Each structure stands twice: as structure tokens, then as C-alpha cells.
């Protein structure tokens, strides 16, 4: 965390 979501 965090990471790419888009």
C-alpha cells in the first residue's frame, strides 16, 4: 500500500 487502481 498504496498501489495503482486506475
Amino acid at each position, epitope marked *: 500500500a498504496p498501489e*495503482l487502481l486506475g
Partner: antibody
Amino acid sequence: QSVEESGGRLVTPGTPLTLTCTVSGFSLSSYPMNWVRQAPGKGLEWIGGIGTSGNIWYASWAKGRFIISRASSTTVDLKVTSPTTEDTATYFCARGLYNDYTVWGPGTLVTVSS
Amino acid sequence: QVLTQTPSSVSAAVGGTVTINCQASQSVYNKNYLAWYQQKPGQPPKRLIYSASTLASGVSSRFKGSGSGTQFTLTISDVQADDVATYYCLGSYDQAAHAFGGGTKVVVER
């Protein structure tokens, strides 16, 4: 590659609702999945989304009101625990949100009313 | 993230150019994590631009994205009568949590 939402309906205020995002043509595990909503005549709002690993994020206002997870090998759900009239909106699900691999669903309409 | 689009509405004659602004509270991820969406009534949102300036697949070159960090802009050259829509910017600070701007309505003049 395509997604589609399911579960849009008339719900009473306070009764738990669960929306479902079914995908096709790609692995659910390979791409990140997002939930967006839109109240009638209002703007788009990012609710939350899940990454490739499995971890989940929510918007600041959406913390607690929404629960996102994978419910199938091919599905991603969105449970609103205590729906109110403010939650009446078209809920969208989408592969990604930003990169060129992005594909949205048609959207499912939720009406919170008694 | 809180992104603000001002003004809320912009106008042009059939053939003109409009400028749609988008300011972030703080800088987006890598200074260029910003996308633009188009939503005509009834349809689901259409992604036009990502990476601040990069045109999406198939989108016309009439739509021009520019900006870095906190201030961004969507320019629409040669406005068609068909461009009646609300445009939203999409940003992120840490690439996970996203946020849409308020939207800017495009009014075609006549």
C-alpha cells in the same frame, strides 16, 4: 473486454443493498476495478476500488458507508450498509479508470425510496 | 483529493474554442496523474485524455490537455454542436485514491 453492473433497484432507506460487477474477456485478477456513482443531474464521484493484489481503497466520505470486495472469480461487489435518499444514483463499475485499458460498464440505477 | 473546476460552465459558437480549467488542492502523482472525461446526457463517461496531455485511443486532436502538478486545462478547438456535455477532470495524489472535479458544462452558442 467489458464490464457490467447488476443489482440496481428500488431500495428502502436503511435496508442493505449489494451491487455486482461482472467482467468478461479479461482476468479480474490482472486489472484494478473501480466503483463510481452519479446522483441525478449531479457530478461523478469515485467511491472506491480494488487493486491487483486485493487491497481496497475508498473515498474520504465513503469510508464505512461502502464495502467493496471480490465475491467471485468473475465478480466484484459493492455493499451499501445503510442506504439513504442521498444514495440514489447510477452506479458505474469500470476496469481501471485512468490508463488506456479503461472500460466502463453501462451503469445500474439505484433508487433509495420507501 | 479535492479537484476544483472553474468556472462551472463555458461557452462557444459552433466552431470556436473553449478552455476548461482544473485546479488540484495539492500536486497529483508524478505531476501528471490527471485525466479528462466527457459525459453526454444518458451515456456513460468517455475518457478523452490521460497523463495531463496524452490523447486517449481514438479521441480527436481537437481536445488538448496541458498542465502539471496542480494546475491543469482542457482546451477544445473547433467546437461542434455535438460537444454539448459536462467535462470532468480526474486526479490522484498517490495513484490509488482518485477524485473527480465538479464538472464544467459546455454551452454551444448561437
